[PDB]
Amino acid sequence: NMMWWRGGVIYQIYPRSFLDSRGDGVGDLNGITEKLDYVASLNVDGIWLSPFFTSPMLDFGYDVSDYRDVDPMFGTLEDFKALLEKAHSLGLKVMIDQVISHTSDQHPWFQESRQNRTNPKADWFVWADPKPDGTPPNNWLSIFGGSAWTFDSRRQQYYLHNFLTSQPDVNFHHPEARQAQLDNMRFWLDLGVDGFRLDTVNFYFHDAELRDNPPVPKGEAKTLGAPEANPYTWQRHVYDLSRPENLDFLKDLRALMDEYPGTTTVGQIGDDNPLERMAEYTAGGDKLHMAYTFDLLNMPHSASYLREVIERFQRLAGDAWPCWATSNHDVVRSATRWGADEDPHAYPKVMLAVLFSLRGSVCLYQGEELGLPEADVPFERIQDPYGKVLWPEFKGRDGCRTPMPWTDGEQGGFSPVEPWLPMEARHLELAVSRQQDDPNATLNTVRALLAFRRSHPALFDGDLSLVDVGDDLLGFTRQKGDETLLCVFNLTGQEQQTTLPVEVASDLPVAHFTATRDGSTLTLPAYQAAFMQVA
Template sequence: MAQQQWYKGAVIYQVYPRSFQDSNNDGIGDLKGIINRIDYIKSLGVDAIWISPFFKSPMKDFGYDISDYRDIDPLFGDLNDFDTLIEQAHARDIKIIIDQVLSHTSDQHQWFLDSRENTSNDKADWYVWAEAKQDGSAPNNWLSIFGGPAWQWEPRRGQYYLHNFLTEQPDLNFHNPDVRQAVLDNVEFWLKKGVDGFRLDAINFCYHDAQLRDNPAKPKDKRQGRGFSEDNPYAFQYHYYNNTQPENIEFMRDIRALLNQYPGTVSLGEISSEDSLATMAEYTEGGDKLHMGYSFELLTDDYSSEYIRTTVETLEQRMTEGWPCWAFSNHDVERVASRWSDNGEINPTQCKMLTALLASLRGSVCMYQGEELGLGEADVAFEDLQDPYGITFWPNFKGRDGCRTPMPWDDQHAQYAGFSSHKPWLPVDMAHKAQSVALQDADEHSILNAYREFMAWRKTHTILLEGDIEFIATAEPILAFYRTLGEQKMLCVFNLGATTASMPLPLSVVTEHNELSHHTGSVNQQLLTLPAFGCFYAQC
């Protein structure tokens, strides 16, 4: 892929550093741990690593509350370790993408410590402050994703500050040009360190409505969560005013202008709005904003072929200029092997099919660590919970710890599955030990080896990296589409169900011969029959 376009069709492997590999045996993963496992990541055939936050932080939200954007928290190492990681990844032709959390900081960031003191200091207008109503209540009805009002009283200033997430994560005031420039300067610090791009956390949350207008109520039948629990009051509102403001478009242009000064670097925006697909299209159009958009639309419980087809088709209709990025799992949602399981049990054949499906959609792909092993959601006891989100909403919503438990590296006899020799920050799931890297490495039919085989095969088919997509009307549980590139055309068919399913084939289809075990199915008189969770690829 050309340097400027390497991200198109790229497979981006997300590393959650706390849980990937512990190199100093304190129970927490770190940058040296990633370096020690860099050859494993290379073996997956991925193009880039996205590393979740490793910056200095009080860790109230495990790194998404940053107190110093230009330094590394000692839990994870130091700047020299990061330089080594960049060097080792680049030596293996792997790009490094890092999280940037721009909309808010930690309440321990020096900017906020200064801002909260009074209304006249140099940073007084760097955060979103507002007067109380006459009765002393919050300025408006905005809610925090993590529960309760999005406003916290600060007695030093005698005002409320806005926090769309935790109380300890105050929102920056992007209406202030000094804030925008300071944020861009922090981004450039890492560009100068040699990173290849940024995953921009909650990027549509940077701006708020300057008039602080109330959000309207949402009818009960419309309260469908995207990345948050549906019994969370946050779902009770249309979030028209606390995020996704029109002023944010110009800031997207500022980010792109900065990245253009560092050729080959890319931006991937995480977007969660009232119409995330429309926002993804808006934030990536014109070639002067984000390179890619990414949302929670396929991180839901709906596993039907109709939902997947409608979601992708809707984005295709709207995103006529930008480039999508799709994911089935990440550090914020239940792992897909459990979430889309037919009966609560992990099905290896289904896991292999889901990898093929995700990597066959038009766009780039984010794969979350452990997805290549088919890991399911870990069952974390209440007394072991770390996630403040889960602690608040227990037991209806158990939070995000179940998808964040340590990677199982060694066989089931290793005490902590090779992650650490010290008790980990979250317990290793017993079921994960039986899915360890060591055991799957030795099994030629494992989910891990099927993953490697498919990714290697995909790289030999440019049509899957860059081609257009056109869906075929099919009955459940079949999902089928064409990928086209110039004169080339490939049919991709997936059985999402746990029983055999069939569909008629066009006369033009000639079966592509290959030895991949997860390319399954038989053709008899133009009728394609797929076994449970089967896949089929054919040249047309």
């Protein structure tokens, strides 16, 4: 089945916070290998591993110094091969992150590049002369704070970095660099991986003319890939990323992926118009297989908003394929980000039902199946550098990166010592051991939802058609050939009622969800979901 990815569910693993098996407080590959049975018990189709490659860990993995090796803190290449084999033996696909838009400054490429203007790798990165007054070439801002340019005295030149200063951006306008990254991907492809999560996929190319970005009109909706307090949201990003040439490169990338049947790619979109960019990137069947945005990774979460997102995406290319995610290593956990003012146990269930019922692929973040809320990390335990620039208006991403609670024992059974990030007390209450045999628990709801999803083709890659179910409900039909399912969701803490826009043949029960269908009237209690078979 070469089309497993088109509708499949992927479980994201953040290597540093999954399981420590070496007793150093940091998660490693062998721990993941140890918990692959649990992962498979989740009824997911595969996994996505955040960067485990050689890195100074300034951005904790996303600042790579060696693309073709495992950082000794996570383990070895052989350990990864073992992980891959065990995951394959359990029927799990293995996707790994690929951070090719920027390297660490400790990467040999940049170490050679920064020496002068004539060295073999001088144009592998984005270098530019200062303005006559000595200031950066343009008004481009780094997401992690300050200018996107940093002066280097060896070359008398600013280098570009959309993120950390220790994360210089790769110059994709230089062909040999692009090809170098392609080969770096071919390495892992030859190892036998099942796919790649493409980090900052729309960031690859920049405007070679280094043109200034226009400011954002005051009172307009800021970009969804950054907090409000970030000055990065003050300007419209048109020249610093999302260049036309990128499309071409995508094709190239796709071609590489096409050399290995069964493989797939999911790109991370960070753009002013994310749905349009995703649809543009995943259409044609000759570029990205799929991609995800920040549309479901932000604050709005009502049925009206979800309807708006779906409508906005359906406006675009019909041959595009979205991947939907409500949580990851960059945002506040959905149980808190979306359901802070909702029921702690009831809301995540129906939210996950919605996520699993959307047309497209799914990214399920580690712990989200347990309904884990965001952890409040104290200032002296902050690890993420992004949490030290906008404090206290923005405290970084460490809250969603606290270690996985396997038991309610010491350190959640994550480590025999104090972990790199502290263990959340609330997470101990929602630990796997406490949750493994609880029928009312979120974990079993996830298992049942995914099993139910697996048993219905319409819920894999069927068409989605919105129906009028009212303001405070989310209703649509999923249709694939023989099957047509009516899906209605109540995301509120109140009982909702509606008249069925279509006629129903039967009810489809799943995971203790309860709704009453009397005549033409469907009634859903708080945080309940209703699946039905359309006549």
